[PDB]
Structure formats: structure tokens, C-alpha cells
């Protein structure tokens, strides 16, 4: 069973924030719930998450902080589902905040973008039943 206020979908429980945090803080929040930032592995799961977040920048459990792109729960990135907006990920430095872009988020249309990990975005936690 999923906890109260969590949403069950295909053997996973999801929690959709209605507040924003920097990626590291969202990551910590999910771990303290015995969960992890959402790991998207199919078009079905992608459509499900999109439905609940709406047209809002939302962090997921995908990052390339100090190494290649990796899912927070160990799921393989190279052989897995991807939904990047064409021309992403670009590791952009042009925001002028220092560094590239190391954290993935759903954009307003659901396609993914890599962005500055310090930005405060909403987030999604996931746990597997
Ligand atoms: N702010 C916005 O909402 C503008 C969306 C269009 C540009 O999108 C940006 O393009 C950059 C490269 O030119 C880099 O890739 C950023 O990560 C990316 N930002 C977003 C949020 O997509
Ligand atoms: Ca998942
Ligand atoms: Ca990067
Ligand atoms: Ca980008």
C-alpha cells in the first residue's frame, strides 16, 4: 500500500510536491521519505507523471553530477528511456551562474532539460511497492 497523499501507478507510489527546492534538497527530501526522486523508464510512466505535474518545471532523479548521466536508484541511463527536448542535454554555461547544467527536469511540455542544480523547482518522489 502507498502512504496517504501518494498516488499509486503500476506498482509504484508517487508524491508530487507543490513547493520548490534545489535538486540536492529535493533528493534529500525523497530519501527521508524512504523514497527517491522519480526515475522514468517508459512512455507510460512519462505520460502518468506529466498528467500530475502539469506545465511546471519539475526535478526528476537524473543527474550528471561528477560523472556520466545516472538515475538516482542505479537504473542504467544509456540503455533506458529518454525524453530530452531536441538539442538537450547541452550542459549550458551561458546562464552565467558558474558551471554547466547537471540536473534533469521535466519542462512545461514534459520533455526533459538539463539545468543548474541550484534552481528551485517542484519535484516528484517515487517508491516501489
Ligand atoms: N528559461 C526558459 O524557460 C527559456 C526556455 C528556452 C531556452 O531553454 C534553455 O536553453 C538553454 C540553452 O540556450 C539551456 O539549455 C537551458 O537549460 C534551457 N532552459 C530551460 C528551462 O529549458
Ligand atoms: Ca519509475
Ligand atoms: Ca552536465
Ligand atoms: Ca539545458
Residue numbers in the entry: 152 to 280
Q: What does the paper behind this entry write?
A:
Herein, bifunctional probes have been developed that target the hepatocyte‐specific asialoglycoprotein receptor (ASGPR), the expression of which decreases during NASH progression. To analyze how the probes, bind to the potential NASH biomarker, X‐ray crystallography and saturation transfer difference nuclear magnetic resonance (STD NMR) spectroscopic methods were used.
The 1.4 Å electron density maps showed unambiguous density not only for the GalNAc moiety, but also for the first 4–7 atoms of the linker. The density for the linker confirmed that the binding site was occupied by our chemical probe, rather than by the free monomeric GalNAc (control experiment) in the mother liquor. In the crystal structure, the 3‐OH and 4‐OH groups of the GalNAc moiety are bound to the calcium ion in ASGPR where the 3‐OH group is in close proximity to the calcium ligands Glu252 and Asn264, while the 4‐OH is very close to the calcium ligands Gln239 and Asp241. In addition, Arg236 makes bidentate hydrogen bonds with the oxygen of the acetyl group and interacts with the oxygen at the 1‐position of GalNAc, where the linker is attached. The nitrogen of the N‐acetyl group interacts with the side chain of Asn264. Finally, the 5‐hydroxymethyl group of GalNAc is stacked onto the indole ring system of Trp243. The linker itself does not appear to interact with ASGPR and is mostly disordered. In comparison, the scaling factors of monomeric GalNAc are significantly lower indicating the lower affinity of the single sugar moiety compared to the triantennary GalNAc groups of the probes GN‐01, GN‐03, and GN‐05. Additionally, the CH2 groups of the aliphatic linker region of these probes show strong, positive STD signals due to binding to ASGPR.
